[PDB]
Design a protein around this ligand. Sequence first.
Ligand SMILES: CNc1ncnc2c(C)n[nH]c12
Ligand SMILES: [Cl-]
Ligand SMILES: [Cl-]
Length: 148
Amino acid sequence: ENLYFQMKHGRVFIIKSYSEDDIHRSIKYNIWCSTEHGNKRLDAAYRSMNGKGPVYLLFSVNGSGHFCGVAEMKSAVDYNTCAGVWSQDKWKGRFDVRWIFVKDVPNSQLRHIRLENNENKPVTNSRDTQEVPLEKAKQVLKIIASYK
Ligand SMILES: CNc1ncnc2c(C)n[nH]c12
Ligand SMILES: [Cl-]
Ligand SMILES: [Cl-]
């Protein structure tokens, strides 16, 4: 048995990227930036955690059909940073991450996990910074960890 992920202090978000280059840049430099509303959501979760648990980010390129890895938020959002460092000049700010898992996990492995906070929709049909309920997040993380 693996009862590791089966922990009450942690919050988990879906991150969608239109750009594969932005994924590569995030992995190389351990940074990210979301939309205005996404940054606001992630910053609030990180700050309210107060280091009592992780904020996990489940990354997936839009249209790719798979998740590509898992990172932990590692700083609050700095909203005043160099512009234009990502593929599109649509993002304002920066925060630190730590990629802890880089591997492709097909949507077929995850699509039976549904989000009660998003109309029972499959977790694989989420938009950027959709939050995942912790009990569903534990199921997702266990599947990502054990996929081969
Ligand atoms: C740098 N951050 C990003 N890059 C490309 N796409 C997205 C989305 C949909 N949210 N944040 C994104
Ligand atoms: Cl699908
Ligand atoms: Cl999206």
